[PDB]
Amino acid sequence: MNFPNSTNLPRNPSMADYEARIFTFGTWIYSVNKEQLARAGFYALGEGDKVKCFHCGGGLTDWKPSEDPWEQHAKWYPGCKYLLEQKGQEYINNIHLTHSLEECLV
Numbered sequence: 001m002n003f004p005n006s007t008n009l010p011r012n013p014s015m016a017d018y019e020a021r022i023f024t025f026g027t028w029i030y031s032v033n034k035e036q037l038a039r040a041g042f043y044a045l046g047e048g049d050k051v052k053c054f055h056c057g058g059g060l061t062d063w064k065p066s067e068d069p070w071e072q073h074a075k076w077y078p079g080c081k082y083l084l085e086q087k088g089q090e091y092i093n094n095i096h097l098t099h100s101l102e103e104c105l106v
């Protein structure tokens with residue numbers, strides 16, 4: 001995998017628009033909602049349920065129905081400027097705390 005983009009400039013500007021991201025999914029069979037994915041910056045690659053964020057370039061796969069796009073975006077790509085713009089560092093910290101705590105109980 002490539003290093004995550006942490007600048008304020010998106011790595012894939014062709015996918016900066018919500019509607020452009022939506023088109024990439026086509027008929028979507030997966031447990032996670034495509035519009036929810038698009039809203040969280042993600043577009044489909046067309047193999048299984050692999051998605052990439054247009055901004056950080058961050059890739060995710062194998063979506064369980066309990067996995068939220070924004071939460072996962074924060075878990076795995078915490079430097080993403082798009083994430084920070086949309087959700088705020090307050091949200092981002094609670095998510096980190098929550099995940100880093102879930103381990104304790106597990």
Ligand SMILES: Cc1cnn(C[C@H]2C[NH2+][C@H](C)CN2CC(=O)N2CC(C)(C)c3cnc(Cc4ccccc4)cc32)c1
Binds near residue numbers: 001050061063076
């Ligand atoms: C394989 C893998 C590792 N962890 N998980 C658990 C899942 C659970 N569902 C969640 C929705 C996401 N999880 C993490 C995940 O998806 N990560 C974590 C990471 C960053 C190490 C990683 C690397 N590379 C892939 C592959 C890839 C996907 C898009 C484009 C190109 C390659 C996935 C992935 C799956």
Ligand code: NA
Binds near residue numbers: 046
């Ligand atoms: Na498809």
Ligand SMILES: [Zn+2]
Binds near residue numbers: 054077083
């Ligand atoms: Zn991102």
